[PDB]
Design a protein around this ligand. Structure first.
Ligand code: CHT
Ligand code: CHT
Ligand code: CHT
Ligand code: CHT
Ligand code: CHT
Ligand code: CHT
Ligand code: ZN
Ligand code: ZN
Length: 178
């Protein structure tokens, strides 16, 4: 390529000054975003339609990588686009792209609730107390709802029931929980 960096500015193959545009510099094999002031975007987000991109230090577009911003982790896909509402390995990124921690996740593809502990790992084959109530997560992390777990009963919200009547449809009989 005959494209060249002159400080933070990029001259294109034809010698024109890049500005307000993406450039792909084969010398780095990297995308870069050149701002309206003809300087490359660096250590910043770029919104383009619905999509977010992150320009790292030196202006390289982030891609297939995790970035930390204001104490939150964001994943950029192969094309540089910030992932939203998805599992990225064992992590879940929410609506804003931020890795979910200490919170519920409803995933329509498993039709199941999950809980990501503060430590960033999904609850799995275990009891947790979440906001003062008890919830049991199966293998794979799926919240158990409306069933007996040992001597305990978890209701439709997944919360262990403390006391009261339950009509069990499995046994077609009334139980009193104390
Ligand atoms: C844009 N880079 C900083 C990567 C190259 C020019 O110095
Ligand atoms: C970065 N572009 C949006 C220019 C293409 C996807 O990588
Ligand atoms: C701009 N951020 C990537 C930090 C948030 C998008 O919801
Ligand atoms: C539901 N998870 C994505 C958490 C695991 C599937 O194997
Ligand atoms: C978010 N919760 C799992 C507690 C509600 C399920 O119905
Ligand atoms: C739970 N009881 C059977 C005791 C009353 C509701 O019909
Ligand atoms: Zn060249
Ligand atoms: Zn898992």
């Amino acid at each position: 390529s005959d494209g060249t960096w002159q400080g933070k500015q990029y001259l294109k193959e034809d010698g024109s000054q890049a500005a307000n545009e993406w450039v792909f510099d084969t010398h780095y094999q990297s995308w870069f975003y050149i701002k309206a002031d003809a300087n490359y975007a660096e250590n910043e987000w770029l919104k383009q339609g619905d999509d977010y991109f992150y320009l790292k230090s030196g202006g390289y577009m982030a891609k297939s990588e995790w970035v930390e911003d204001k104490g939150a982790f964001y994943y950029l896909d192969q094309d540089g686009k910030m992932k939203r509402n998805a599992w990225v390995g064992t992590s879940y990124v929410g609506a804003t792209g931020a890795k979910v921690i200490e919170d519920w996740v409803y995933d329509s593809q498993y039709d199941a609730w999950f809980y990501i502990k503060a430590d960033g790992q999904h609850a799995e084959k275990e009891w947790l107390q979440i906001k003062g109530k008890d919830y049991y997560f199966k293998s794979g992390g799926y919240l158990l709802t409306s069933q007996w777990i040992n001597q305990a009963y978890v209701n439709a919200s997944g919360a262990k029931v403390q006391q009261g009547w339950l009509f069990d449809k499995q046994y077609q009989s009334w139980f009193y929980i104390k």
